[PDB]
């Protein structure tokens with residue numbers, strides 16, 4: 001009942017997201033968007049959750065973790081159970097799927113979680129294609145003069161486009177109300193593909209904030225007792 005939203009910054013056209021345990025770029029305006037989207041809520045009494053792979057947790061600078069004003073969940077196969085408080089603002093879980101079921105319990109959550117953000121790991125993102133209701137994808141393009149950075153971790157663009165459609169016309173409505181963005185909705189062609197979203201430029205890169213939403217599903221079966 002609480003929306004599950006994958007959120008990621010990916011470099012076009014291969015949708016690379018990482019290299020050697022870290023990000024392949026440093027974009028302050030991209031980080032600002034991420035922080036504000038995942039932190040801010042429409043209901044002032046709720047917080048959002050951020051779920052992440054263990055390797056992604058270990059990549060966040062120790063001073064900035066756990067991410068403030070969000071419930072942090074770190075998933076590891078070596079952790080103890082489905083959703084355990086281990087420190088203030090930190091839950092541990094040995095199962096991505098089970099922790100989500102756990103977080104969706106209104107008895108447990110008191111309807112005080114507004115959104116569940118899946119904030120990554122390539123490995124986590126691979127398993128979230130069937131879990132997420134939406135994807136917030138920052139589509140990043142190196143500007144003409146910019147060197148394409150080396151990358152070893154990738155978003156599954158095939159799986160994304162099988163299950164989700166580009167819903168960027170609804171990005172602004174979809175973001176928490178208090179967020180303000182510098183750009184206006186733009187449609188640009190880039191290396192053959194349509195890039196639609198809210199444009200930003202920083203350092204050697206042009207990027208678009210986009211929103212992907214699950215495709216309409218046929219009604220094949222509804223479980224009756």
Ligand SMILES: NC(=O)C1=CN([C@@H]2O[C@H](COP(=O)(O)OP(=O)(O)OC[C@H]3O[C@@H](n4cnc5c(N)ncnc54)[C@H](OP(=O)(O)O)[C@@H]3O)[C@@H](O)[C@H]2O)C=CC1
Pocket residue numbers: 007008009010016017018019020021022023024052053054055056057059075076077078093094095096097119120121122123124125127153
């Ligand atoms: N550009 C972007 O928006 C982002 C990029 N990244 C990048 O992604 C890379 C990290 O991704 P990746 O290497 O795939 O690692 P992940 O962050 O996805 O973490 C992988 C680990 O998570 C645990 N795990 C995976 N699936 C489950 C599950 N179903 N249940 C419980 N635990 C699970 C395992 O931990 P264990 O081994 O302990 O059992 C596994 O080793 C880095 O390069 C990082 O910079 C990360 C976030 C955002």
Ligand SMILES: CCc1nc(N)nc(N)c1C#C[C@H](C)c1cc(OC)cc(N2CCOCC2)c1
Pocket residue numbers: 007008009022023030031032034052056059060061064067118119120136137138
């Ligand atoms: C914008 C990056 C980002 N953008 C988008 N659109 N989605 C995401 N899921 C992430 C992400 C991410 C990971 C968790 C990350 C990596 C990192 O570098 C290893 C530093 C941080 N920080 C240091 C600064 O403030 C707290 C969060 C977060």
Ligand SMILES: [Cl-]
Pocket residue numbers: none
């Ligand atoms: Cl599994």
